[PDB]
Amino acid sequence: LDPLSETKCTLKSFTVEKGIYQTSNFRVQPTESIVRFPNITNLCPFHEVF
Amino acid sequence: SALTQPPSASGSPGQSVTISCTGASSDVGGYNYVSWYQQHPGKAPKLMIYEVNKRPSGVPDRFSGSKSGNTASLTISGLQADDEADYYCCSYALSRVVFGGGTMLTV
């Protein structure tokens, strides 16, 4: 909800003293799309073996 | 694939003739999956040449076979009157037998 509740959950307590008192979390930017770039080709002669 | 055979063949008795067969496929087993059949007008065909480096029993040595690349050859040493029949080549490599268009051999 808010950084106060986040640091409360981090400290596992409903009361937080003065100061940072801990490191809240780490920022991680997520992905927005997908890029599957494999090659370009024709089918495989699996009938020659099976 | 489909096999290709000449429309007809001609040859005088005593000489030799050759029948071509282009289009034989192959697999991981080998390249000798070529067979030949002779069918006289009015009866069922008969297996003449199979595994061209070999031949069945009861067949004279006049019928010979060979293969160079993707082309098969049927060699007949002596031509006789009872040789006029339709000769088909068959490819049985990829678990699928395919008969060619056939050739008319007349003496």
Is B1's Cβ below 8 Å from some Cβ in A?
no
Judge residue B8's burial from the number of C-beta atoms within 10 Å of its C-beta, 0-12 exposed, 13-18 middle, 19 or more buried.
exposed
β-partners of residue B20 are B73
Q: Dihedral of CA B92/B17/B22/B99: which sign?
A: negative
Q: Which residues of A touch B (CB under 8 A)?
A: 47-49
Cα distance between residue A38 and residue A2, in whole Å: 42
Q: Whose CA is closest to B24, among B14, B15, B13, B34?
A: B34
Cα distance between residue B64 and residue B74, in whole Å: 6
User: Determined by which method?
Assistant: cryo-EM
Contact A47 B94 (CB under 8 A): yes
Q: Whose CA is closest to B24, among B96, B75, B86?
A: B96
Q: Which residues are within 8 A (CB) of B73 and not within 5 positions of it... i.e. 6 or more apart?
A: B18, B19, B20, B21, B65, B66, B67
DSSP-H helix ranges across A1-50? 3-11
Written as one letter, the residue type at B9 is A
Torsion of the alpha carbons at B42, B46, B48 and B49, rounded to the nearest 10: 120
